[PDB]
Amino acid sequence: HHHMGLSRVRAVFFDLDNTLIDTAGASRRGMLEVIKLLQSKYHYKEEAEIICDKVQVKLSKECFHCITDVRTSHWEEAIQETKGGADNRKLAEECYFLWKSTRLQHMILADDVKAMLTELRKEVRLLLLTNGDRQTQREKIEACACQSYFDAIVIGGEQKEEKPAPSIFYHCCDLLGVQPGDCVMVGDTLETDIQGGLNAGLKATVWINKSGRVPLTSSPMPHYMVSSVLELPALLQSIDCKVSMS
Ligand SMILES: [Cl-]
Ligand code: NA
Numbered sequence: 124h125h126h127m128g129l130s131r132v133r134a135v136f137f138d139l140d141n142t143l144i145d146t147a148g149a150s151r152r153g154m155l156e157v158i159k160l161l162q163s164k165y166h167y168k169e170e171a172e173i174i175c176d177k178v179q180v181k182l183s184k185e186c187f188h189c190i191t192d193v194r195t196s197h198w199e200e201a202i203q204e205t206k207g208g209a210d211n212r213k214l215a216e217e218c219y220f221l222w223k224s225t226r227l228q229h230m231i232l233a234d235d236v237k238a239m240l241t242e243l244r245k246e247v248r249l250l251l252l253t254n255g256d257r258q259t260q261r262e263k264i265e266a267c268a269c270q271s272y273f274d275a276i277v278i279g280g281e282q283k284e285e286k287p288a289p290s291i292f293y294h295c296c297d298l299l300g301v302q303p304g305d306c307v308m309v310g311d312t313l314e315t316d317i318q319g320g321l322n323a324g325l326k327a328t329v330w331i332n333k334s335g336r337v338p339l340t341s342s343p344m345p346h347y348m349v350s351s352v353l354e355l356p357a358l359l360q361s362i363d364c365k366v367s368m369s
Contacts, residue, residue, distance in 0.1 A: 126369045132326060132359050133301045134248035134274075136292070138310035139260065142331050142352055143236060143251075144267045149229035153222035154179070160221055165214070170205050177201035178222075187285060190256045195219045227266040239353055240272040247359065248299045252308070254279035254286050254315060275299065286310075287319030296323075307362070309355060318343035327362060329355065 140146040154175040161167035161174070181197040198215035232240075243249060251273045253260050257280040264270055275298050279285025282294065296303050303324045310316025311331040320328035321343055330345035331352060347358055 124369075127366050128369050129363065129365070130304075130326075130367060131363045132247055132307050133305035134250060134296070134299050134307070135243065135355070135359065136250045136252040136295055136306060136308045136310075136320075136325075137273075137352070138312070138316055138331070139251055139253040139263060139269070140255075141311045142309060143232060143269065144230040144263065146226070146230065146263070149226040150222070152229050153225035156225045157218045157222050160217065174198075174201045174205045174218075177204060178218075187254075187279070188256075190258050191219075194223075227262060230263055230267045232267050232269055232272075235353060237272070239356065240269075243356065243359070244272065244274070248274045248301065250274060250295050250299060251276040252279075252286065252291070252295055252310075253277070256280040286315040287317075287322050289319065289323040292319055292323035292325065307359065309352060313338070313343045313345070317345045320345075327358075329358060 137143060157175055158167075158171040161171040167174075178197045178201045181201065182194075185193070195212065195215050198218045199210055199212055202211055202214060202218075203209075240249060249272060251264070251269065253264075253276070255278065257278055260278045260280065264276065270276065275295070277291065277295050277298070279291060282291050284290050286292075292303060292306075292308070296306060299306075304326050306325050307327045307329060308316055308320035308325050309329040309331065310320075313330065317328045317330055327346040328343075330348045331350070332348050333350050335348075335350065337348075349355065349358070
């Protein structure tokens with residue numbers, strides 16, 4: 124009956140945010156543009172940063188479920204908490220849409236990532252697996268124009284559950300006509316991407332960790348850790364050489 128053999132990767136699932144695009148940095152540039160607006164146009168002082176930081180936290184505390192309203196309100200609340208006064212929706216909308224336009228303008232696929240994705244697609248299925256609200260993620264995808272690189276795109280806000288729930292990963296596999304055991308997840312977040320891949324029994328999880336710092340407490344343990352998605356082909360190539368029982 125049984126024998127040694129190889130088992131090639133058939134599909135790679137990629138995060139979008141902070142994996143393929145610099146969401147973190149694009150977002151800092153947005154906040155810098157809002158600070159510039161508030162300081163020059165509205166003569167804010169160090170309050171400008173306080174407000175932006177407040178909104179960063181508020182953003183980070185959103186729950187998975189009308190995003191423009193929600194996000195404009197973050198701004199409204201943050202301005203009111205800092206500056207007092209009645210609600211200022213027009214200033215909040217100015218800030219919000221400036222943060223939003225700026226960050227989207229700065230979301231781009233690097234040329235070397237384009238070339239890597241193009242090359243990889245010859246050999247494996249590529250799927251974009253991205254958590255977040257449908258509108259927001261779609262706007263990101265359109266801004267960095269990455270749709271043409273992927274066999275499929277799955278957005279968590281369009282599904283019953285998102286990462287790390289294993290169901291979304293099984294949906295990805297079904298879309299591609301592959302098994303979880305054939306798929307590699309690549310992403311920069313332990314609690315969603317990595318745990319999610321572990322939950323779903325994926326062939327491997329690859330943690331993108333630019334800094335290289337590892338946590339000190341219990342956490343999901345990825346199979347691999349790399350600085351950049353550009354290190355992925357070698358890993359895949361090496362996975363494709365691993366011997367296991369038939
Ligand atoms: Cl976001
Ligand atoms: Na991410």
